[PDB]
Amino acid sequence: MTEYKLVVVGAGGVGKSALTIQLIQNHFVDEYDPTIEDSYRKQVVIDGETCLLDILDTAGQEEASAMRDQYMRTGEGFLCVFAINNTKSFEDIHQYREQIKRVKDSDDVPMVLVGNKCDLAARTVESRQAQDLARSYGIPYIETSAKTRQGVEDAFYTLVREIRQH
């Protein structure tokens, strides 16, 4: 069993915790309880190979913004999450991308761009704009709903494939 260290990052309230708990427990969390730092494990077969995912769920609130280097050092791959009804959270993506690159001293870190809350009709970030950004990073873009499960396995397991092929 290969172990993969995944880290979920992004602005406060975009659904990092809801995405993770949907993956882990098949349950949608309605409450908004701001995370400090949580960690989960999941054994799962991906492309015929069993692995063990360690998933770090991080703090999006700005008051925790000085405490990120320590988890970025440990992570192998990063889900970079914004909410498609929150343009500020999309603008925050590049700050996470640049910090991860600095901390890991690498232009080639496994990452997936995730546009969450795709169950909501009132979108303010267009798919094309996010896809353009993902292409500029060399990474895939996956839209998700922690509420309905749409795209959730695809986002996490695509990140695993990235780490595997790194």
Partner 1 sequence: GQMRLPSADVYRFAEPDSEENIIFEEGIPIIKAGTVIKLIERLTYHMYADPNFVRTFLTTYRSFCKPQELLSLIIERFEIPEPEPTEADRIAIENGDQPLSAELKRFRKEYIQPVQLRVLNVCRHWVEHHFYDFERDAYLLQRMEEFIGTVRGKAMKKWVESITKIIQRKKIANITFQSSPPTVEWHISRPGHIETFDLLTLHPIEIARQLTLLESDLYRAVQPSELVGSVWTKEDKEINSPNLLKMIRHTTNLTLWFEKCIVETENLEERVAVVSRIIEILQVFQELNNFNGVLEVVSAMNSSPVYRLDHTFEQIPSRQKKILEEAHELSEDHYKKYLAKLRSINPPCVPFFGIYLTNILKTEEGNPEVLKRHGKELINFSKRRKVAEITGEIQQYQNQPYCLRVESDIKRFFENLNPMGNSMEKEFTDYLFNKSLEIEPRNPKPLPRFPKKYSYPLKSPGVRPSNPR
Determine contact, residues 39/54, Cβ cutoff 8 Å.
Answer: yes
Q: Residues in the chain, how many? A: 166
Query: Which residue, 63 or 132, has its beta carbon nearer to partner 1?
Result: 63
Determine contact, residues 88/56, Cβ cutoff 8 Å.
Answer: no
Site for partner 1 in 81-100 (CB under 8 A): 95, 99
Q: Does residue 119 have a known ligand-binding role?
A: yes
Candidates 14, 141, 160; CA nearest to 75 is 160
Give the C-alpha separation, 115 to 131, whole Å: 10
At 132, phi and psi to the nearest 5?
Answer: -55, -45
Q: Which residues bind partner 1 (CB under 8 A)?
A: 1, 12-13, 15, 17-18, 21-22, 24-28, 30-45, 50, 56-67, 69-71, 73-74, 95, 99, 102-103, 105, 148-149, 153
Binding site for GTP: which residues?
Answer: 13-18, 29-35, 59-60, 116-119, 145-147
Q: Which residues bind ligand GNP (CB under 6 A)?
A: 12-18, 29-30, 32, 34-35, 59-61, 116-117, 119-120, 145-147
